[PDB]
């Protein structure tokens, strides 16, 4: 019995007639490159991607961010070509590149990167960390506005918050320094949330900081809707991820319903879901910036539960499933003597009635 | 499943075969997989200090 293929087979296009007059591969890297192309294509037969691939929806994730900038490609391309000619004309750059002693300045690469393609990288990174999925239920946005956050540790040092770098609760005990480029007359809204910190509800999040109606770049002038509260990742709970969200307001907004007392050491008021927050303010508010870090437990977290929150520190533990053992049989034929220890609860001798 | 077969470069017999194939051909072979059912573990509350 035979069934006809449900579609074109892999190597059908090849002509077998002039098999001696066909370009071969001749190399392993040239076959490997074609083999990766056909591995990332849809097929009618069963594939590893079907059973393990991360399922996605056909509905393209909507964009809720700011519009892109408008740039003249022709005038841009012209300036870039000219600069390369000048750089290549210098014989000292040719000699350094031939002797393998040249190097690029890492500080200038990052300043231009943050302007051109940093937002798209930060977006790709946030999708990997699962921020859009949890915060906005799949909706995406490009962070057009670079958000520079940094925690003051001591009097001379700074711990920069980028996109997933580790930061301790000891360094994050006091509010950070937030700077971002904005025009005069604009209104913004900052926000800090713990996606994984919640102790009771999985889906919910804790609100750590909320500043509303910020004029321009001056963060202090902004109203303090929710005071700063340091992260308190429980012990044995893993690594958490806190996100700084920057919204661009179109007009002055009233956050009376989202207001929280000063201080707010109750975890039921701190509870907060970003999706609902933005959904009722999406008409007048738009996401513009993003930054996040990862946090573990340290000794300072015990000071937060005891003193600030006036509660007992919860301690978790990673527990694994109990090992599998087949059903014990009366005559375990050919099994070693230690077969009986696998079904034994206690290790101390028993004596029964005696 | 049916997946694309890429041998290891050290393996000479298989690498001497793909270098003689026409450009555009790809070799396929049948692979068996196990899709895990249970997670590595869970975080459980053990104390309130």
């Amino acid at each position: 019995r035979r069934t006809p293929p449900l579609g074109p087979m892999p190597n059908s296009d090849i002509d077998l007639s002039n098999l001696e007059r066909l370009e071969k591969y001749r190399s392993f890297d040239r076959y490997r490159r074609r083999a990766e192309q056909e591995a990332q294509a849809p097929h009618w037969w069963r594939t590893y991607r079907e059973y393990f691939g991360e399922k996605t929806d056909p509905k393209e994730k909507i964009d809720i961010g700011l519009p892109p900038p408008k740039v003249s490609r022709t005038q841009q391309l012209l300036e870039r070509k000219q600069a390369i000619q000048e750089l290549r004309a210098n014989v000292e750059e040719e000699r350094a590149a031939r002797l393998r002693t040249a190097s690029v300045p890492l500080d200038a690469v990052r300043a231009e990167w943050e302007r051109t393609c940093g937002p798209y990288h930060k977006q790709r990174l946030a999708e990997y960390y699962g921020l859009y999925r949890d915060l906005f239920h799949g909706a995406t946005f490009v962070p057009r506005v670079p958000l520079h956050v940094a925690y003051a540790v001591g009097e001379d040092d700074l711990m920069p918050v980028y996109c997933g770098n580790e930061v301790t609760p000891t360094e994050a005990a006091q509010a950070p320094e937030v700077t971002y480029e904005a025009e005069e007359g604009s209104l913004w809204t900052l926000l800090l949330t713990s996606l994984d910190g919640h102790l009771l509800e999985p889906d919910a999040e804790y609100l750590h900081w909320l500043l509303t109606n910020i004029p321009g770049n001056r963060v202090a002038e902004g109203q303090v809707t929710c005071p700063y509260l340091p992260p308190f990742p429980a012990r044995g709970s893993g690594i958490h991820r806190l996100a700084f969200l920057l919204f661009k307001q179109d007009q002055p907004i009233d956050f009376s319903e989202d207001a929280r007392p000063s201080p707010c050491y109750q975890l039921a008021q701190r509870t907060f879901r970003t999706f609902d927050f933005y959904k009722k303010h999406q008409e007048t508010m738009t996401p513009a910036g993003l930054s996040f870090f990862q946090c573990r437990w340290d000794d300072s977290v015990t000071y937060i539960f005891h003193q600030l929150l006036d509660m007992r520190e919860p301690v978790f533990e990673f527990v694994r499933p109990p090992p599998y053992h087949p059903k014990q049989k009366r005559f375990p034929h050919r099994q070693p003597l230690r077969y009986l220890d696998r079904y034994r609860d206690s290790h101390e001798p028993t004596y029964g009635i005696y | 499943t049916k997946e694309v077969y890429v041998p290891h470069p050290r393996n000479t017999e298989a690498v001497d075969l793909i270098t003689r194939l026409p450009k555009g051909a790809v070799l396929y072979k049948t692979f068996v997989h196990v899709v895990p059912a249970k997670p590595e573990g869970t975080f459980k509350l053990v104390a309130m200090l």
Partner: peptide, 21 residues
């Protein structure tokens, strides 16, 4: 498997020159 539509997907020796001393 011979009865299945994806039978013959692993065939490779028709793409190679017959080299039989």
């Amino acid at each position: 498997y011979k009865t299945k539509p994806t039978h013959g997907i692993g065939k490779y020796k028709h793409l190679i020159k017959a080299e039989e001393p």
